[PDB]
C-alpha cells in the first residue's frame, strides 16, 4: 500500500532505446505503453524491437503495450545541396512539385507533397518547421508556388509544412501506410494510431485495412488537424470512430494557434473521456530532455495540468527514441505524474450527473466508482474483466484510487496498460463467483497493494447464464 | 475590440536601457515595470523610474513600478577558478571564511555564514536550482563537509537551497534597508519583500517604507517552504500582504517541481479569496533570451496560469538581459488574450455561501453578479479615488473589462495591477448620476464602448463625509 502512479507514460522506440540496455531501463522506470513510429526505421527493426520488448516484459513481469504509429502524408520541403540559409525581409521563395534536391538558398525547393499546388490560393500562409520559418504564396503556376518571407529563420532538411487553419487535402492513408499496417499486423500491435485522419471514414478505412490483415487493434486517432477540432461535430465524429484520442500537439497547433491549443486540448480530453474512449496527450512533453538530464519547470507544469484534465497517459517522443537520457526521462516524468495526482481537483468527480446509461456494465462500474470514492476505508477498485472493458469505463472517473483489472489475457492486459489508473493484473483461476472475487483480493494482498483491513470495491460477471456480461459489485474484507 | 485582461510585469535592465527598448515593451503592453535590486546602482534605478513615468506620460498610459528587494544572498561566494565537477561519491566542503580561494578539490566560501548551524547530517543542499547537490556528512565550527551525490558544473555566485525548509536567514538585510530607501525616493507603487518567513517580516519591511515616508503596497515574495507548510502558515503571509508573488524559482527547488503547481494553484485561489492580487512570477517564457519565440510548454505554463486566475504573469531576464524584451512582452499577450477565451476563466460562482460585512465590498459583488448575468452589458465601471472596488470587483472571473475611474495618479498606478482593470483618468467636479454619465460617455468617446451597450458603474453617493463606494447603476451609452 504505497500510492501508485495512475497516469501513465508512453514512449517511443529508437536508437536511444536499442543502444546498450536502455530499453529495458525505459520499462523499469515505467513505461506502460511503447510507441514504434513507423516514419522511421524498417519492418525488420520494429519486429525485432516487438520481439526484445515482449520478453523484457516476461522477465520483469510487466504488462506493456505496443503502440503502433502510421506516419501519413509526408508534407515536407524535401532536401537541398546543404545550404540552409533564408533571410527575413520579403524574399521570394518557390516550392516546385517537380524539383530533386537542387539547394533552398534562393527561391527554390521541392515538396514531396506534390498536391500542395492544387490546395493553396495567394494570400494563404505556409509555416514550415512549426513556425520557425513561415511564408505567405503570392501565385501558383502548374507545380510552382511562389511565396514570399515575412518571417523567417534557419530551414533544413525534410521541415514539415503546414496550412494555416486547415485546408490540405492529401489522403490520410499513404501507400507506406498501407504497407505498415501490414506490419503492425504481423507484429501484432495492440493500438494502431493514424496520422492526419480528415474525419472518421479516414479511421474507418484504416480499420479495414487492419481487419483484411488479421489485426483487430485498437484505433487511435491523432487529432492533428485545425478540420477536426473547428466544431462539436467534427470532434465527435473523428472520436467516436476511434477507440483511443491522442492529442498531437506539434502541427495542431501550429495549424490553429498555439494558445487556442489549450483550450482545444482540455476540450479534446474532456470529450474523450465522456464518450468512454481513452487519451493520449502527446508530442514532446518534455522536450529539454534530449539534451539535459532535469525538465525545464514550464515542461513540468505542461505535464502536470495535462494529468489535471483528464489525460490517461502522456508520451515521449525524441526524449526516449533519439535523447541522452532514456530511463531518465521516464522516471522524471513519472515523478512530476504522482506530484499532480496529489492535487485535490483530479481525486473528484461529480459521478455523471444527469447522465443516463442503457448499459449494465457502464451502470456496475459508474456505481462502484461512486461507492469507492465515498466510504471511509476504501484502498482499491478491482474490475475482474476478460476484455478490459470495466477497467475503461471505471478509469473514466476521476478518483485517487488504483483499479486493478484482472484478466488471463495478455492482450487484455497489455490493452489495460493504457488506461488512467489501471494496474493490470494477471489472474486465472477456474473459480468464479466470491470464490474468485477473494482470491484475487488475496493475490492483491500476496503482492502488497491491500492491507488486511481494507475495504474494496470488486466488479463481476455473475449470472446463471452465457447472456451478458459484467453485473455485480461486491464490497469486502481484506484477508 | 476585446481587450486583455491578465496583466505583465517586466523586469528593466541593460536589454531596456539599450536602444529604445523601454518604451518598445511598454508599447507592447507592459503594465507593471519591475527594478530588481539585485542589480545595478540606486542612481540606475533612479534613471529608469523617471524614464517610465516619462514614457508613459508621453504614451497616456498607466504603468505601475514595482522595487522588488534582493533579500539574503545564500549564495557560495566566488573562487579563483572551479567551473566544472564530477561526483560518484566526491567530497565537497563549505567553509563560510573564504573570499576569493578555488572550488575544486572541496572548498568554497558561503556568503550567508549562519548555514553551517542550520544543515545537520543527512541534509541535502541544491546548488544552481539543483543543477548540483550534496548531501551533507558533518559540521564542525564553521566547516560542514558534505558528499555531491547530483552534480555537474559550479558557476560563479550560485544560489544554495535546503531540501525543504530549514534555513534561518534574516529576510530583511542591510542592503534591503538602504533599498527599501531608494524605493521610498523613487515612489515604488509595490514592494516586493524577499524570503518572508512570516507575516512579521512583512510587517517589519512595511515599518521600515513607512519610516521612510513609503505608503506602497507590500508584495510577499512566496519562496520557503515555511511559508505553505499549512494553511495557517499561507494565511499568515498572505494577510500581512498587499499582493503575493509565486516564487516559483527558489520554492520549486526546496519542496519539489511537482508540488509546485498544486501550491501555485491554492496561493493564487487563496490570494483571490482574501481579497489580495497575486502575480505569478519568474522566467515565464525563459526561452526568449535567445530565440524569438517561445517553446509550447511556456505558452503552457503561461496560459495555464492565466486559467488558474493570476493577477498578473512576470519577465524577468527576457526583458532585462535578453534580445527580444518587446517581442517577449507581445507574445506574452498574445497567449494571454488567447487563454482569456475559455470559459472555465470568463464564470463565477460569485462566492456562494460567503457572507460580507462591508457595504463597498457587497456593491462589488453584486456588481459583477448583475455584470455577468444581464445580457448586453459591455464594460464595469468602478468610481473608485482609491481603487478598492476595483481591487474586489476584479477578484471576481469574468470576460469583461473593468475600467477603474480615479483622478490620482498613484490609484491609476496602482490599479494597472489588478487583472482585467483599465485604469482611466477622471476627474468631474460633478456628482451623482452627472459623474456617473459623464464617465461613461467619456469612455465611448476613447472607444471603449458603443452606444447601444449596457455598463454597470459603482460609485459613492450619499450627502455625508461618511463611508465610501455605496450605489450600483445599470446605464444606456449615448
Ligand atoms: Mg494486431
Known amino acids: 500500500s504505497r500510492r501508485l502512479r495512475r497516469t501513465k507514460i508512453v514512449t517511443t522506440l529508437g536508437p536511444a532505446t536499442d543502444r546498450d540496455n536502455n530499453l529495458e531501463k525505459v520499462i523499469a522506470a515505467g513505461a506502460n505503453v511503447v510507441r514504434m513510429n513507423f516514419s522511421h526505421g524498417s519492418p525488420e527493426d520494429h519486429k525485432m524491437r516487438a520481439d526484445k520488448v515482449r520478453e523484457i516484459a516476461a522477465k520483469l513481469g510487466r504488462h506493456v503495450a505496443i503502440l503502433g ?3 501519413g502524408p509526408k508534407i515536407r520541403v524535401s532536401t537541398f545541396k546543404e545550404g540552409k540559409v533564408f533571410l527575413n525581409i520579403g524574399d521570394k521563395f518557390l516550392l516546385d512539385a517537380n524539383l530533386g534536391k537542387g539547394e533552398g538558398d534562393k527561391e527554390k525547393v521541392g515538396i514531396d507533397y506534390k498536391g500542395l499546388p492544387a490546395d493553396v490560393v495567394p494570400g494563404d500562409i505556409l509555416l514550415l518547421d512549426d513556425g520557425r520559418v513561415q511564408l505567405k504564396v503570392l501565385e501558383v503556376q502548374g507545380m510552382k508556388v511562389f511565396t514570399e518571407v515575412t518571417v523567417g529563420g534557419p530551414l533544413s532538411n525534410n521541415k514539415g509544412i503546414n496550412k494555416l487553419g486547415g485546408g490540405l487535402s492529401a489522403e490520410a492513408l499513404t501507400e507506406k501506410d498501407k504497407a505498415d499496417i501490414k506490419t503492425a499486423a504481423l507484429i501484432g500491435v495492440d493500438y494502431l494510431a493514424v496520422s492526419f485522419p480528415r474525419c472518421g471514414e479516414d479511421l474507418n478505412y484504416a480499420r479495414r485495412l487492419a481487419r483484411d490483415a488479421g489485426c483487430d487493434a485498437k484505433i487511435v486517432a491523432k487529432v492533428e488537424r485545425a478540420e477536426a477540432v473547428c466544431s462539436q461535430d467534427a470532434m465527435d465524429d473523428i472520436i467516436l470512430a476511434s477507440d483511443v484520442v491522442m492529442v498531437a500537439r506539434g502541427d495542431l497547433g ?21 464518450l468512454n474512449r481513452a487519451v493520449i496527450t502527446a508530442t514532446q512533453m518534455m522536450e529539454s530532455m534530449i539534451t539535459n538530464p532535469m525538465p525545464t519547470r514550464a515542461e513540468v507544469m505542461d505535464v ?6 483528464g489525460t490517461d497517459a502522456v508520451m515521449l517522443s525524441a526524449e526516449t527514441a533519439a535523447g541522452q537520457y532514456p530511463s531518465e526521462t521516464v522516471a522524471a516524468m513519472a515523478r512530476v505524474c504522482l506530484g499532480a495526482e496529489k492535487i485535490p481537483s483530479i481525486n473528484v468527480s461529480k459521478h455523471r450527473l ?21 466510504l471511509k476505508g476504501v484502498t482499491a477498485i478491482i474490475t475482474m474483466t476478460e476484455s478490459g472493458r470495466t477497467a475503461l469505463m471505471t478509469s473514466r472517473i476521476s478518483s485517487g484510487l488504483p483499479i486493478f483489472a484482472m484478466s488471463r489475457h495478455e492482450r487484455t492486459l497489455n490493452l489495460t496498460a493504457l488506461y488512467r489508473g489501471v494496474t493490470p493484473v494477471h489472474f486465472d483461476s477456474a473459480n468464479d463467483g466470491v470464490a474468485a472475487a477473494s482470491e484475487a483480493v488475496n493475490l492483491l494482498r500476496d503482492k502488497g497493494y491491500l492491507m488486511s483491513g481494507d475495504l474494496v470495491i470488486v466488479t463481476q460477471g455473475d449470472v446463471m447464464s452465457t447472456v451478458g456480461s459484467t453485473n455485480t459489485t461486491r464490497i469486502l474484507t481484506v484477508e
Do not use: C, T
Open 254 to 274: 501550429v495549424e490553429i494557434g498555439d494558445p487556442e491549443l489549450v483550450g482545444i486540448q482540455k476540450a479534446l480530453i474532456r470529450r474523450a473521456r465522456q
Open 304 to 309: 502536470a495540468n495535462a494529468v489535471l484534465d
Open 69 to 71: 504509429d502510421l506516419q
Open 354 to 374: 444527469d447522465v443516463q446509461f442503457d448499459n449494465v456494465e457502464e451502470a456496475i462500474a459508474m456505481s462502484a466508482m461512486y461507492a469507492a470514492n465515498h
